Amino acid sequence: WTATSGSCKGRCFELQEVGPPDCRCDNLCKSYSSCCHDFDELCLKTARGWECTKDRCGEVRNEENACHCSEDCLSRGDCCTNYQVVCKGESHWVDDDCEEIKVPECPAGFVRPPLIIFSVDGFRASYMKKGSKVMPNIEKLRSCGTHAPYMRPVYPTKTFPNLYTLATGLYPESHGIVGNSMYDPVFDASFHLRGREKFNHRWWGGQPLWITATKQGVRAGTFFWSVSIPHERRILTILQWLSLPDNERPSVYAFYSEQPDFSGHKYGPFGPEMTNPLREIDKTVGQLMDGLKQLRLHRCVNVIFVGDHGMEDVTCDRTEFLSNYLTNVDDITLVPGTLGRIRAKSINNSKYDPKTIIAALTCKKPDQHFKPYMKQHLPKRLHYANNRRIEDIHLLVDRRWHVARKPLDVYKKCFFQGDHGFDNKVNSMQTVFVGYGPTFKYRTKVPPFENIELYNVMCDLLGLKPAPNNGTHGSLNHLLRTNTFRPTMPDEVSRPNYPGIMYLQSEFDLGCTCDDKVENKLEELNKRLHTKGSTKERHLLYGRPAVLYRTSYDILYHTDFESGYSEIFLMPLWTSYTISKQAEVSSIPEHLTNCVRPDVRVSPGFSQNCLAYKNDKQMSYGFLFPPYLSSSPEAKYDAFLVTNMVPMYPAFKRVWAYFQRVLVKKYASERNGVNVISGPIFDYNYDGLRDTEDEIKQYVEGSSIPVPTHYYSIITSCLDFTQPADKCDGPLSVSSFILPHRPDNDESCNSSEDESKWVEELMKMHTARVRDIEHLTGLDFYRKTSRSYSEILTLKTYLHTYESE
Ligand SMILES: O=C(c1cc(OCC2CC2)c2ccccc2c1)N1C[C@@H]2[C@H](C1)[C@H]1CN(C(=O)c3ccc4[nH]nnc4c3)C[C@@H]21
Ligand SMILES: *[C@@H]1O[C@H](CO)[C@@H](O[C@@H]2O[C@H](CO)[C@@H](O)[C@H](O)[C@H]2NC(C)=O)[C@H](O)[C@H]1NC(C)=O
Ligand SMILES: [Ca+2]
Ligand SMILES: [Cl-]
Ligand code: NA
Ligand code: NA
Ligand SMILES: [Zn+2]
Numbered sequence: 001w002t003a004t005s006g007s008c009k010g011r012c013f014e015l016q017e018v019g020p021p022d023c024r025c026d027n028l029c030k031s032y033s034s035c036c037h038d039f040d041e042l043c044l045k046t047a048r049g050w051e052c053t054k055d056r057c058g059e060v061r062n063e064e065n066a067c068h069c070s071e072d073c074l075s076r077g078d079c080c081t082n083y084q085v086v087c088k089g090e091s092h093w094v095d096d097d098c099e100e101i102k103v104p105e106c107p108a109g110f111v112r113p114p115l116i117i118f119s120v121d122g123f124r125a126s127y128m129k130k131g132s133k134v135m136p137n138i139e140k141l142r143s144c145g146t147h148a149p150y151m152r153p154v155y156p157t158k159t160f161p162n163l164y165t166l167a168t169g170l171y172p173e174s175h176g177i178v179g180n181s182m183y184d185p186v187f188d189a190s191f192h193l194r195g196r197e198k199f200n201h202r203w204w205g206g207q208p209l210w211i212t213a214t215k216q217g218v219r220a221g222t223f224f225w226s227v228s229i230p231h232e233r234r235i236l237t238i239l240q241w242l243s244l245p246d247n248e249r250p251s252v253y254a255f256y257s258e259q260p261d262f263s264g265h266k267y268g269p270f271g272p273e274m275t276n277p278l279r280e281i282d283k284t285v286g287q288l289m290d291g292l293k294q295l296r297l298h299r300c301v302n303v304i305f306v307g308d309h310g311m312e313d314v315t316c317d318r319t320e321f322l323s324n325y326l327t328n329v330d331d332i333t334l335v336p337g338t339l340g341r342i343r344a345k346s347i348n349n350s351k352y353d354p355k356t357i358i359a360a361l362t363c364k365k366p367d368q369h370f371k372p373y374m375k376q377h378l379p380k381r382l383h384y385a386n387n388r389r390i391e392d393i394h395l396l397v398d399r400r401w402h403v404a405r406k407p408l409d410v411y412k413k414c415f416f417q418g419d420h421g422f423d424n425k426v427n428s429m430q431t432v433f434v435g436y437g438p439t440f441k442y443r444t445k446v447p448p449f450e451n452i453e454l455y456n457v458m459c460d461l462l463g464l465k466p467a468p469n470n471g472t473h474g475s476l477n478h479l480l481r482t483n484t485f486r487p488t489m490p491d492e493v494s495r496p497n498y499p500g501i502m503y504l505q506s507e508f509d510l511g512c513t514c515d516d517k518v519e520n521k522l523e524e525l526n527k528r529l530h531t532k533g534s535t536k537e538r539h540l541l542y543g544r545p546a547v548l549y550r551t552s553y554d555i556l557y558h559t560d561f562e563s564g565y566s567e568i569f570l571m572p573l574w575t576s577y578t579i580s581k582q583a584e585v586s587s588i589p590e591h592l593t594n595c596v597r598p599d600v601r602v603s604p605g606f607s608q609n610c611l612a613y614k615n616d617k618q619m620s621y622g623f624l625f626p627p628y629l630s631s632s633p634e635a636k637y638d639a640f641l642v643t644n645m646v647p648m649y650p651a652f653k654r655v656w657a658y659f660q661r662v663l664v665k666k667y668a669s670e671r672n673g674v675n676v677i678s679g680p681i682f683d684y685n686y687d688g689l690r691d692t693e694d695e696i697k698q699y700v701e702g703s704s705i706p707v708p709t710h711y712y713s714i715i716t717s718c719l720d721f722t723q724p725a726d727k728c729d730g731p732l733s734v735s736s737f738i739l740p741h742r743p744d745n746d747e748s749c750n751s752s753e754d755e756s757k758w759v760e761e762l763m764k765m766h767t768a769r770v771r772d773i774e775h776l777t778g779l780d781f782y783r784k785t786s787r788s789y790s791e792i793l794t795l796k797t798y799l800h801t802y803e804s805e
Contacts, residue, residue, distance in 0.1 A: 008036045012043035013237045015222065015250065027237065030226040032199070050232040050287075052080045057087035067236055074294065077243030081235065081287035084294050093289035093298060094137045098144040104438040106300035109246040113438055114301045115461050116238070117223075117254045118288070119166070120281060121159060122261025122420065123307035124269050125150035125430040127278060134275055135282035137289060138434070141305055144443060145436030146479050152450040152799070153309040153431055155382040155424040156339050159261070162308035162451065167208035167223070169455025169469030171383040173390065176205035181335055182389045183343070207467035209458055213252055216464050223254035231257065231284045239291040252462055255288070257281055261311065261420075268417040269311040269428065302437030302461050306454070309420050312399050312428040314338070316414030319402040320369050326360050329405055338421025340370060340395025340403040354393055361395075363749035369401040371747070376686035379766050380710065380738045380776070381799065382424065383470075385686040399426050425767075425801040437461075439483050446479050450797065460485055472771055475793035489789065490780055492546035496555040496564060499601040508604045511611035512596035516637055527634075533557040538726055539577045541675045542716065543784030547573070549690070556601060558638040561625035567606040568693055570705050571646050574679040574779060575624035578726050579668040585628050585661060592627075592640065599643040607642050608705050616701035618743060622648040624678050626660030646680055647700050647707050649743040655762065656711065656739075658755035663763070664715075671717040671733065673725030680708030681738060681776045690778040710738045712773045714781065731787065735800035738768040738776065770796040 001021060008025040017026040023036035025043065045066045048056070052069035061070040066080075069087055073079035084090040104113045128147075132139045154165045154172055158180045161172040172178040182191040182203075191198050210220040221241055225234050238253050259277040267273040285305070292298040323329045331349060335341040344352040354374070361372040373394045375385040384390060395403050399422050404410050422429055430448070439461050456473045459466040460483045466473065477484040529535075540562050547553065553566040553573060561577035596610050613621050623644050630636035638644070648656060667674045682691040684698075698707040714736045718728035739762070745751035750758040770781055774796070782792045 002032075002034045004035070004037045006036045008039050008042050011036075012039075013240070015219075015241075015248075017222070027222050027225050027229065027234075030228055031224075032196075044229070044233060050080060050236075052083045052086040054086060066232070077240050077295075078236065079291075079294060081239070081291040081294070085290070090293075092286065093293045094140050094286055098140065098443075099299075100442045101299045101438040104300050105296075107296050110300060111246070112251060112463060113461070114242065114250075114297075115252045115304065115458060116288070116301050117166075117252070117304045117306065117458070118257075118285065119163070119254065120257045120261075120305070120307050120432070121259065122264045122309065122311045122418075123281075123432050124260075124264070124310035124428060125307070125432050126269075126310075126427075127260070128432055130270070131275070131278045134279050135285075137282050137286040138305060141285070141303065141436045142434045145303075145434050146440040146442075146444045146446060147434045148432075148446050148448050150430035150448045151307065151433040152448060153307075153424050153429060154450070154452060155384050157309040157420050157422060157424050157426075157429040159308060164204065164208070166306065166308065166451055166454055167210070168206040169452050169466065169471045170206045171452065171470050173383055173385060173387040174206060174470065176203055176387065176389065178384070178387055178389050179335065179339075179341070183333075183335075183391075184389050186388060206469070209252065209455060209464075212459065212464055212467055213462060218252065218462055218464060219248075219250040221250040221253040223256075225256055227258065231255075231280075232287065235284060235287045235291060238288070239295065242292075242295055242297060252458070255284075257284065264311040264418040265416050266418070268313050271417065299438065302435065302439050304454070304458070305432065305434040305436070306451075307431030307433075308451075309431050310426075310429040311418045311420050312422060312426070313417065314400055314402060314419035315417055316402075316410055318369070318400055319404050319407075319410055320397075321404050321407055322361070323406045325364055326357065332357070332405075334403075334405045335391070336404050336409070337402055338397050338419050340372075340393075340397065341391040342393035342395070343391040357393060362746050369398040370395045370403050373747075376683075376709075377740055377742070377747070380683075380688065380772055381766070381768050383688055383772075386688065397422060399423075399428060425799075425803060427803045427805075435479060439481055440479060441481055444479075446476075447794070447798075449476060449794075450799070453797070456485070472793050472797050474790050475797045477790040478794065484790070487789065487793070489783065490546065490548055492780075493549055494547040494551050494553065496544075496547075496553055499554050499556075501600050503598075503600050503603060505598055505600070508598040508607070510596075510598060510604065510607060510609040510642060511614065512598070512609070512642065514595035514597050514637075514640060515591040516595065516597065516640075527559070530559040531557055533562075535559060536562055539675070541576075541578060541726060541728075542732075542782045544576075545574055545677070545779040545781045546783055547778060548780055549778045554602065556599070556641075556643060558625075558641075559635040560629070560631050560638065561644075563624065563643065565602065565643050567602070569680075569682075570606060570608050572624055572643070572679055573777060574677050575644070576675070576677045577625050577629070578673065578675045579629055579664055580673040580724060580726065581669050583629065583631070583665065583668060585665050586630060586636070588627050589633075589636075592636070595637075595640045596621075596642055596645060597637065597640045599641045602643055608645055608700075609642075609703065612700045612703035612705060613647075618649065619647050619700050619707070620650050620653060621645050622653055622656050623660075626664065628661045629664065646711075647705055649741065651744050652711075652739075652741050654745065654751075654755060655759050658759045659713070659763065662755075663760065667715055667717075668725075671715075671725065672721045672723065673717055675716045675725050677714040677716075677781070679712055679777065680741075681710035681712055681773070682706060683709045683776055688772070688775050690776055708741050710741055710776070712736060712738050712768065712776070714770055714773065729786070731791065732782075732785070732795055734770060734795055734798055736768045736770055736773060737763045737766050738773060739763065739766050764802045767800050767802065769799045 003021040006023040011025040024034040029035035056069040456471040474487045563572040627639035696706040717725040719731040719733045
């Protein structure tokens with residue numbers, strides 16, 4: 001109940017929201033149907049419009065107006081945004097030349113530049129260039145401030161997941177809003193857009209910027225606006241708040257626009273109907289900067305023009321229906337649209353088997369436009385699994401398509417022409433970022449970056465300490481004039497051992513063999529220096545990775561590669577080697593196909609054995625440094641050490657071999673040498689973090705050799721490719737993958753064909769950031785370069801997406 005029999009006189013758009021039975025006057029009260037009886041009268045005045053005219057100048061203050069052009073309207077803080085243009089001969093902000101803001105120019109009593117977040121729903125990144133002629137104010141923000149060509153949203157590219165990610169810096173699996181629609185089995189509650197359950201706080205995890213601000217003594221305007229409140233009224237309310245007394249005045253504000261998302265759904269991303277919404281948004285920005293100019297706040301506020309996601313072309317006729325794939329389609333609940341999430345309809349159905357459902361959806365139609373996944377098998381770059389609200393079964397939908405349950409769900413719910421939600425690396429889902437103010441840089445373009453990074457920056461601009469989030473704090477310092485946060489490198493926690501020759505061949509009883517006994521001092525001191533590290537500078541280009549947890553591991557040096565070998569996991573954590581453009585691929589000689597060699601530096605007890613692989617009919621093995629890439633016949637025998645060996649399903653060896661035999665050399669010659677760091681990953685609880693020894697769920701049968709869930713590689717080279725990867729002066733270039741270690745290739749529908757037709761497409765799908773691998777390995781890379789650490793942080797968040805323009 002709400003007693004609407006109170007008043008809002010003086011309380012219009014109050015900042016401290018009251019609770020029932022007191023009627024509300026806050027910018028959200030209509031969404032609760034809770035406002036006082038006179039809220040519309042007193043707070044949403046519409047009389048005479050939103051602009052001044054000449055004949056209104058110097059008028060007699062008539063309080064019924066939506067805004068005022070009376071001579072006293074400034075001291076009251078409530079002029080129309082164009083008042084000083086019409087009445088005082090001044091200029092619109094957009095008509096003023098671009099002028100560098102070298103220092104904040106704030107009025108007295110402003111303790112810091114305020115931050116205004118101007119968020120636009122569905123603002124596809126390409127709008128910045130394609131719509132530039134009809135958005136003059138935004139183009140001035142973009143070109144004078146700091147901008148990226150696009151900003152990568154989080155998956156799913158949906159409204160609530162991305163708005164809350166912006167506000168928290170957290171992947172949706174951590175902050176809990178993993179769709180616009182969710183079922184939580186622990187609550188037995190549902191989150192929808194229709195209803196009041198979404199207003200309950202048990203859904204919203206982490207700590208958003210407004211809580212973070214408040215907890216640290218910075219006041220925040222209330223970020224959310226009920227739909228009915230006109231944009232003009234939101235802008236003015238923000239301006240009014242900026243005129244409050246110093247002790248009352250918030251320091252961070254938000255504006256939200258439903259456009260161009262709303263129209264982009266009806267008319268598609270580039271419908272002719274889309275010019276006008278882009279014009280209007282720009283007008284809204286124009287009113288804000290005009291109103292800031294009237295407040296002498298236009299070279300003092302920091303403004304973030306930011307989108308939540310893009311918009312793709314989608315029509316009802318491009319819909320895949322599960323009724324054509326399954327028989328008993330009523331035994332499942334499907335969350336539909338641009339992604340699919342399947343669970344059982346009834347919790348008391350023992351005939352429900354997710355395996356038969358995944359199988360009935362796998363490569364069934366020749367060109368089918370979605371692909372089923374168990375969520376732990378999703379590309380680790382999406383980080384979309386570690387939450388009970390994410391159903392076990394997931395459908396990744398090709399851009400431009402939908403997935404539905406039965407046809408009747410599409411025609412009893414054509415209509416729309418735009419949608420979003422797809423994979424967050426799709427070009428159409430990319431959105432915008434622009435920063436403008438004294439704390440941003442001037443006329444500076446910065447590379448694309450992920451929106452999980454912004455929360456740390458907004459904390460910087462506001463002087464706040466960020467709650468723990470998934471940003472990499474300092475990877476965006478190159479957007480800032482000042483307030484850059486200077487991080488130190490994490491300290492190494494385990495130091496390695498450097499073992500020498502300590503065991504004899506006969507101490508090993510591993511079941512391996514090698515046709516190698518067909519073995520000079522003119523080059524025997526040569527191979528001694530190799531095993532002590534004489535060539536480590538060629539293959540460990542950016543220093544060894546630091547182990548950020550407590551474990552026992554050895555550094556092993558070889559002519560062609562160095563490893564960091566773990567006695568706890570009986571395999572390297574990392575293996576590092578450089579391949580120049582000149583390097584030649586070689587075969588595995590016929591006599592060495594089944595060669596595996598004891599490593600006289602590592603005890604038998606801390607070594608894999610070959611019998612375990614003979615006995616496990618499902619498991620085979622591979623090598624981290626590839627034998628194909630040896631530098632000489634004599635070096636090749638090092639690639640066959642038991643300490644270079646890792647467990648691999650035969651189906652994954654198809655993939656892994658083609659990467660080592662073909663792609664590494666292809667990349668060496670395209671990029672003028674590459675340095676490659678490879679290794680295993682264990683993520684059996686799909687939380688994106690390195691498993692501990694007691695969390696392994698699978699071993700090579702009859703052994704303590706743990707089976708990785710993934711294999712990674714980090715391919716580095718010189719950004720200026722006219723310098724070899726091993727003689728690089730300047731910035732670096734990187735790509736990486738986290739490949740799922742799976743016993744089939746069902747993810748790849750074309751895997752019955754030659755590896756040249758499918759393997760690299762799979763690797764592209766599972767591209768990763770270096771940062772992602774660090775979470776999964778406890779390793780810290782790039783510890784010793786010539787570059788600045790901030791630059792190195794940006795590199796580690798770099799993601800290579802293989803998208804066009
Ligand atoms: O008022 C805020 C708001 C603003 C925020 O941050 C704005 C600030 C950053 C600048 C938030 C931040 C974190 C959490 C919630 C937030 C809510 N909304 C009001 C609308 C929108 C955001 C929510 C989703 N929605 C839709 O009607 C809708 C729109 C497009 C769609 N497409 N497909 N389905 C769709 C459904 C109803 C709610
Ligand atoms: C993303 O950031 C969050 C916050 O640091 C991480 O989540 C925390 O993880 C630890 C370990 O599981 C828990 O004790 C905390 O309760 C978690 N907090 C939240 C809010 O989830 C999360 O692990 C990070 N993800 C990645 C991939 O690094
Ligand atoms: Ca884990
Ligand atoms: Cl959704
Ligand atoms: Na075998
Ligand atoms: Na296949
Ligand atoms: Zn939308």
